[PDB]
Write an enzyme that holds these catalytic residues in place. Structure first.
Site, PDB file in Angstrom:
ATOM      1  N   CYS B 107       8.673  -3.322  -2.006  1.00  0.00           N
ATOM      2  CA  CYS B 107       7.736  -2.405  -1.429  1.00  0.00           C
ATOM      3  C   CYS B 107       7.915  -2.302   0.235  1.00  0.00           C
ATOM      4  O   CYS B 107       8.181  -3.184   1.064  1.00  0.00           O
ATOM      5  CB  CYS B 107       6.394  -3.459  -1.714  1.00  0.00           C
ATOM      6  N   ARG B 110       4.916  -3.182   3.194  1.00  0.00           N
ATOM      7  CA  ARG B 110       4.630  -4.768   3.507  1.00  0.00           C
ATOM      8  C   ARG B 110       4.193  -5.044   4.953  1.00  0.00           C
ATOM      9  O   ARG B 110       3.486  -6.408   5.281  1.00  0.00           O
ATOM     10  CB  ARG B 110       5.627  -5.562   3.152  1.00  0.00           C
ATOM     11  N   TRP B 279      -1.882   2.455  -0.707  1.00  0.00           N
ATOM     12  CA  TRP B 279      -2.134   3.978  -0.523  1.00  0.00           C
ATOM     13  C   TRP B 279      -0.571   4.511  -0.654  1.00  0.00           C
ATOM     14  O   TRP B 279       0.059   3.853  -0.608  1.00  0.00           O
ATOM     15  CB  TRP B 279      -2.682   4.606   0.676  1.00  0.00           C
ATOM     16  N   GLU B 284       6.618   9.415  -2.963  1.00  0.00           N
ATOM     17  CA  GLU B 284       6.260   9.056  -4.600  1.00  0.00           C
ATOM     18  C   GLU B 284       5.785   9.999  -5.088  1.00  0.00           C
ATOM     19  O   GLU B 284       6.124  10.533  -6.505  1.00  0.00           O
ATOM     20  CB  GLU B 284       5.340   7.700  -4.554  1.00  0.00           C
TER      21      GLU B 284
HETATM   22  C1  HEM Z   1      -0.779  -0.292   1.931  1.00  0.00           C
HETATM   23  C2  HEM Z   1      -0.090   0.685   1.461  1.00  0.00           C
HETATM   24  C3  HEM Z   1       1.272   0.559   0.589  1.00  0.00           C
HETATM   25  C4  HEM Z   1       2.250   1.258   0.428  1.00  0.00           C
HETATM   26  C5  HEM Z   1       2.174   2.609   1.405  1.00  0.00           C
HETATM   27  C6  HEM Z   1       3.021   0.972  -0.488  1.00  0.00           C
HETATM   28  C7  HEM Z   1       4.393   1.666  -0.708  1.00  0.00           C
HETATM   29  C8  HEM Z   1       5.184   1.409  -1.619  1.00  0.00           C
HETATM   30  C9  HEM Z   1       6.173   2.139  -2.363  1.00  0.00           C
HETATM   31  C10 HEM Z   1       6.826   3.375  -1.706  1.00  0.00           C
HETATM   32  C11 HEM Z   1       6.768   1.434  -3.271  1.00  0.00           C
HETATM   33  C12 HEM Z   1       7.827   2.034  -4.420  1.00  0.00           C
HETATM   34  C13 HEM Z   1       6.860   2.425  -5.600  1.00  0.00           C
HETATM   35  C14 HEM Z   1       7.912   3.490  -6.665  1.00  0.00           C
HETATM   36  O1  HEM Z   1       8.859   3.794  -6.222  1.00  0.00           O
HETATM   37  O2  HEM Z   1       7.313   3.303  -7.675  1.00  0.00           O
HETATM   38  C15 HEM Z   1       5.887   0.341  -3.333  1.00  0.00           C
HETATM   39  C16 HEM Z   1       6.161  -0.598  -4.606  1.00  0.00           C
HETATM   40  C17 HEM Z   1       5.542  -1.953  -4.698  1.00  0.00           C
HETATM   41  N1  HEM Z   1       4.381  -2.254  -3.599  1.00  0.00           N
HETATM   42 FE1  HEM Z   1       3.763  -1.663  -2.219  1.00  0.00          FE
HETATM   43  N2  HEM Z   1       2.754  -0.372  -1.026  1.00  0.00           N
HETATM   44  C18 HEM Z   1       1.380  -0.679  -0.503  1.00  0.00           C
HETATM   45  C19 HEM Z   1       0.739  -1.470  -0.956  1.00  0.00           C
HETATM   46  C20 HEM Z   1       1.003  -2.315  -1.717  1.00  0.00           C
HETATM   47  C21 HEM Z   1       0.015  -3.519  -2.222  1.00  0.00           C
HETATM   48  C22 HEM Z   1      -1.518  -3.462  -1.725  1.00  0.00           C
HETATM   49  C23 HEM Z   1       0.680  -4.267  -3.016  1.00  0.00           C
HETATM   50  C24 HEM Z   1       0.178  -5.387  -3.691  1.00  0.00           C
HETATM   51  C25 HEM Z   1      -0.643  -6.362  -3.288  1.00  0.00           C
HETATM   52  C26 HEM Z   1       1.798  -3.864  -3.110  1.00  0.00           C
HETATM   53  C27 HEM Z   1       2.849  -4.253  -3.709  1.00  0.00           C
HETATM   54  C28 HEM Z   1       4.007  -3.576  -4.421  1.00  0.00           C
HETATM   55  C29 HEM Z   1       4.986  -3.886  -5.355  1.00  0.00           C
HETATM   56  C30 HEM Z   1       4.776  -5.364  -6.158  1.00  0.00           C
HETATM   57  C31 HEM Z   1       5.801  -2.864  -5.689  1.00  0.00           C
HETATM   58  C32 HEM Z   1       6.798  -2.922  -6.871  1.00  0.00           C
HETATM   59  C33 HEM Z   1       6.381  -2.199  -8.036  1.00  0.00           C
HETATM   60  C34 HEM Z   1       7.446  -1.825  -9.016  1.00  0.00           C
HETATM   61  O3  HEM Z   1       8.457  -2.654  -8.990  1.00  0.00           O
HETATM   62  O4  HEM Z   1       7.138  -0.822  -9.911  1.00  0.00           O
HETATM   63  N3  HEM Z   1       2.226  -2.689  -2.440  1.00  0.00           N
HETATM   64  N4  HEM Z   1       4.899   0.307  -2.445  1.00  0.00           N
HETATM   65  N1  LIG Z   2       1.997   2.959  -3.223  1.00  0.00           N
HETATM   66  C1  LIG Z   2       1.953   2.260  -4.219  1.00  0.00           C
HETATM   67  N2  LIG Z   2       2.780   2.930  -5.350  1.00  0.00           N
HETATM   68  C2  LIG Z   2       2.961   2.232  -6.907  1.00  0.00           C
HETATM   69  C3  LIG Z   2       3.477   3.225  -7.758  1.00  0.00           C
HETATM   70  C4  LIG Z   2       3.882   2.548  -9.162  1.00  0.00           C
HETATM   71  C5  LIG Z   2       5.088   1.663  -9.251  1.00  0.00           C
HETATM   72  N3  LIG Z   2       6.228   2.170  -9.641  1.00  0.00           N
HETATM   73  C6  LIG Z   2       4.563   0.279  -9.898  1.00  0.00           C
HETATM   74  N4  LIG Z   2       4.212   0.288 -11.655  1.00  0.00           N
HETATM   75  O1  LIG Z   2       3.631   1.189 -11.939  1.00  0.00           O
HETATM   76  C7  LIG Z   2       5.034  -0.945 -12.045  1.00  0.00           C
HETATM   77  C8  LIG Z   2       5.318  -0.621 -13.859  1.00  0.00           C
HETATM   78  N5  LIG Z   2       6.888  -0.652 -14.258  1.00  0.00           N
HETATM   79  N6  LIG Z   2       1.511   0.970  -4.603  1.00  0.00           N
HETATM   80  N7  LIG Z   2       0.185   0.743  -4.098  1.00  0.00           N
HETATM   81  O2  LIG Z   2      -0.191   1.124  -2.878  1.00  0.00           O
HETATM   82  O3  LIG Z   2      -0.398  -0.151  -4.480  1.00  0.00           O
END
Ligand code: HEM
Ligand SMILES: N=C(NCCC[C@H](N)CN(O)CCN)N[N+](=O)[O-]
Ligand code: HEM
Ligand SMILES: N=C(NCCC[C@H](N)CN(O)CCN)N[N+](=O)[O-]
Ligand SMILES: C[C@H](O)[C@H](O)[C@H]1CNc2nc(N)[nH]c(=O)c2N1
Ligand SMILES: C[C@H](O)[C@H](O)[C@H]1CNc2nc(N)[nH]c(=O)c2N1
Ligand SMILES: C[As](C)(=O)[O-]
Ligand SMILES: C[As](C)(=O)[O-]
Ligand SMILES: [Zn+2]
EC number: 1.14.13.39
Lengths: 402, 403
Positions: B107, B110, B279, B284
């Site tokens: 992520c 963070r 958000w 993405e």
């Molecule tokens: C506040 C704005 C946030 C932004 C802009 C953001 C952005 C991102 C982006 C660009 C990714 C990669 C997603 C992808 O390529 O599919 C990501 C993955 C991730 N984010 Fe964040 N995130 C945010 C909030 C959160 C929140 C609220 C949580 C959890 C409490 C979180 C948990 C994660 C996790 C665990 C992943 C990995 C998901 C996966 O492996 O498919 N994110 N985030």
């Molecule tokens: N900005 C965010 N993007 C999350 C995109 C999907 C991500 N590949 C996880 N997912 O669908 C895991 C399933 N293998 N998150 N977010 O702000 O909460």
């Protein structure tokens, strides 16, 4: 034990069995992955030598033959009495090609089988090194129809200094640290530029001054040699539709020739073995010209394009980067100098991956280096999982001689 | 020097050492022999995990070694002792959920970790109630376009009893309809969940952006189908700032990214249903969702509209079209007043997060391949930053599909 490797665009799966042949450890451990880091933080030799000779005879389909058995005895005899041995020219040629084939960070490996190998092991002076280097450049450049090549200088020997080329590439632009802290030229070359001056070079004052070479024979101070200008092909950069681009006075040299890496074959180490192929356009257009710590021209180009450099959200950086990469491709194509764009290169690497899967059961690849610096996911390699490991023969980094 | 990994930023020439990795208690997929960093998916034990988490919690409130700390540890050991499991106090859940986000290597958002709104839904007892909680989450998180990060935590997995689960990968997903000619209308990524919805009684639409219903599963029950009231699913029609014809393509995307199939693990306890949302980072949508060949794959269409030479790679038509598509996404979300962050702003904020974390914990686990954006990689600061990747708990983990 054997990693499952998936391509997420096509859904296809393969298993890397080649990684089992790795005998050298990388930087990772089960506790943490260091895959994104750039640099790492007699019976043995005989073991590597035998393995290499085995690889060689297998390559010519003559394993177990008499020539194979006798060559192994020769190597054993030489190491036992002298602590080292020497490669035959044919083995050196096979070894250099395999080192290239094994290089995890090279996206141009589909070409691995076509490499001109220059045996320069009968070199005894820096002056002779210079002559071999000039011939390498002439042959490799070939008037713009670049040909892959490597020149191999004498191997390292116990208690004796190494033959070394101090420059990181045979062609580099000077970097002059200015009084006010900034840099005129290429910031990546400030250190080598200063070393050249310190050794008697009369510096220039331009942004693209080709540096002289600092070549070092064993246990001697390095010597300075100026490359004959007519041997260094350069490409002035202009844009297909933006007439003002040429006014930026940008240019780049045609030949990318790495000269500071060590070539290891059968346990033997070649500290000076410059190699060259041809550029993938993003190396010039994206990294060399747009890196903040390099020529950093993004803002200048954006302003010329009259883009809104006020906020990141206008994507002014992205737009300028694309036009700069386009200018590089257009200009090399106009000058009729070999170059490959990142789409064509990555498409050829996917073919290489398939060729190697069938041939050896896998292909060591470093994802962070294979995926291009712009438009990553628009290329096939981005969606391809890769396994990274060290195979030998190999190209590896070595300490700067100073 | 220090016996910890040395980490360098090649743009600035600065160096740090990661000491936080010493706290990792779970092995990743790499070994000295080979790096698998680019792969997408590569009571005794519960007590140790629980004790570690309690130590983390008490350490965070500056009360390690206190009477309260020792009493909580006692309480957890006894609860596990007689029931086989234990339960988290409210503040422990809030701390654990924020820490799971903070620990997520993939992520880039963070820097916002401390602002998570944690909704406790551990009293949920039916699929219908899961739906109510989910609708409240969506309403709160969307906040008419001024998005607020949030997570709703449903009951943890219990010994014997079935799991609470949301079958859909995100709360908002577009249907993917398999066609006769073998192609797909809509989002190819959602073909399987779409079919499952149909197999469960959903009457399918036939558009390219049909919002899917949710298949919600309460313990030991078959999943139940619920369709989200249109009024609650905020969408943004895509238009381009200068290319007037872009609006005519009829493209759009939803405002709220809400991951719903990940498992939240805290102190050994496993929350199989804990949807979270923040958000979008614009790439993405603009790069991956719209341009991946296996997704909407609109690159050629847009290039043709821009009249580019799609005949040769050398014209960089894919690069030009992708840039305009990402710009349209940013422009449209901005126009509609829906929160979104471009890849330059996001990576810059992540660099700040790395510096904060270096000081606060001695490092930050990060997956370079996921952190560096899909377009313009080296134009962002993260491309030039070396990163150490390792698993810390609390954590968000992938889990098998329930079907
Ligand atoms: C506040 C704005 C946030 C932004 C802009 C953001 C952005 C991102 C982006 C660009 C990714 C990669 C997603 C992808 O390529 O599919 C990501 C993955 C991730 N984010 Fe964040 N995130 C945010 C909030 C959160 C929140 C609220 C949580 C959890 C409490 C979180 C948990 C994660 C996790 C665990 C992943 C990995 C998901 C996966 O492996 O498919 N994110 N985030
Ligand atoms: N900005 C965010 N993007 C999350 C995109 C999907 C991500 N590949 C996880 N997912 O669908 C895991 C399933 N293998 N998150 N977010 O702000 O909460
Ligand atoms: C024929 C055309 C070739 C192309 C298009 C090509 C392309 C590339 C690219 C794009 C990189 C990454 C460079 C960087 O980002 O700095 C690279 C690295 C590398 N290539 Fe190739 N290559 C070619 C030929 C060669 C040859 C001839 C050899 C050796 C015999 C070779 C050996 C390597 C090695 C060892 C690296 C890693 C260098 C490092 O770690 O700094 N390449 N190549
Ligand atoms: N196209 C090529 N590009 C490689 C040039 C730069 C690379 N970083 C080597 N280098 O400077 C290694 C020393 N740290 N190669 N080639 O075609 O021969
Ligand atoms: C820190 C990070 O590893 C570093 O910036 C790498 C990323 N990928 C790269 N890829 C290539 N081809 N060349 C490079 O110099 C780099 N630099
Ligand atoms: C094979 C490769 O690991 C895979 O395509 C990864 C690369 N980096 C990524 N990075 C992000 N943020 N999201 C992704 O889905 C991916 N896909
Ligand atoms: C220099 As301006 C166009
Ligand atoms: C929409 As067409 C140009
Ligand atoms: Zn690794």
């Amino acid at each position: 034990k054997f990693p499952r490797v998936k391509n997420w665009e096509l859904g296809s799966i393969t298993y890397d069995t080649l990684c089992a042949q790795s005998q050298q450890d990388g930087p990772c451990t089960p506790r943490r992955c260091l895959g994104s880091l750039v640099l790492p933080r007699a019976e043995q030799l005989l073991s590597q030598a035998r393995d290499f000779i085995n690889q060689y005879y297998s390559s010519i389909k003559r394993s177990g033959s008499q020539a194979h058995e006798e060559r192994l005895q020769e190597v054993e005899a030489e190491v036992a009495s002298t602590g080292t041995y020497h490669l035959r020219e044919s083995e050196l040629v096979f070894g250099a090609k395999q080192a290239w084939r094994n290089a995890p960070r090279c996206v141009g490996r589909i070409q691995w089988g076509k490499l001109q190998v220059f045996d320069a092991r009968d070199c005894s002076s820096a002056q002779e090194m210079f002559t071999y280097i000039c011939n390498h450049i002439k042959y490799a450049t070939n008037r713009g129809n670049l040909r892959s090549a490597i020149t191999v200088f004498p191997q390292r020997a116990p208690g004796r200094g190494d033959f070394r080329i101090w420059n990181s590439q045979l062609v580099r632009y000077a970097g002059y640290r200015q009084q006010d802290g900034s840099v005129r030229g290429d910031p990546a070359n400030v250190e080598i530029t200063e070393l050249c001056i310190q050794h008697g070079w009369t510096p220039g004052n331009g942004r693209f001054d080709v540096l002289p070479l600092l070549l070092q024979a064993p246990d001697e101070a390095p010597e300075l040699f100026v490359l004959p200008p007519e041997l260094v092909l350069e490409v002035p950069l202009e844009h297909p539709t933006l007439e003002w681009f040429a006014a930026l006075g940008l240019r780049w040299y045609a030949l990318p020739a790495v000269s500071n890496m060590l070539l290891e074959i059968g346990g033997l180490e070649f500290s000076a073995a410059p190699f060259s192929g041809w550029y993938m356009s993003t190396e010039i257009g994206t990294r060399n010209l747009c890196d903040p710590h390099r020529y950093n021209i993004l803002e200048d180009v954006a302003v010329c394009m009259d883009l809104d450099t006020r906020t990141t959200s206008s994507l002014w950086k992205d737009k300028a980067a694309v036009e700069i990469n386009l200018a590089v491709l257009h200009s090399f194509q106009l000058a009729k100098v070999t170059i490959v764009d990142h789409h064509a290169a990555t498409v050829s690497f996917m073919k290489h991956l398939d060729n190697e899967q069938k041939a050896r059961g896998g292909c060591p690849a470093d994802w962070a280096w294979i995926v291009p610096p712009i438009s990553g996911s628009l290329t096939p390699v981005f969606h391809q999982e890769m396994v990274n490991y060290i195979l030998s023969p190999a190209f590896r980094y070595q300490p700067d001689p100073w």
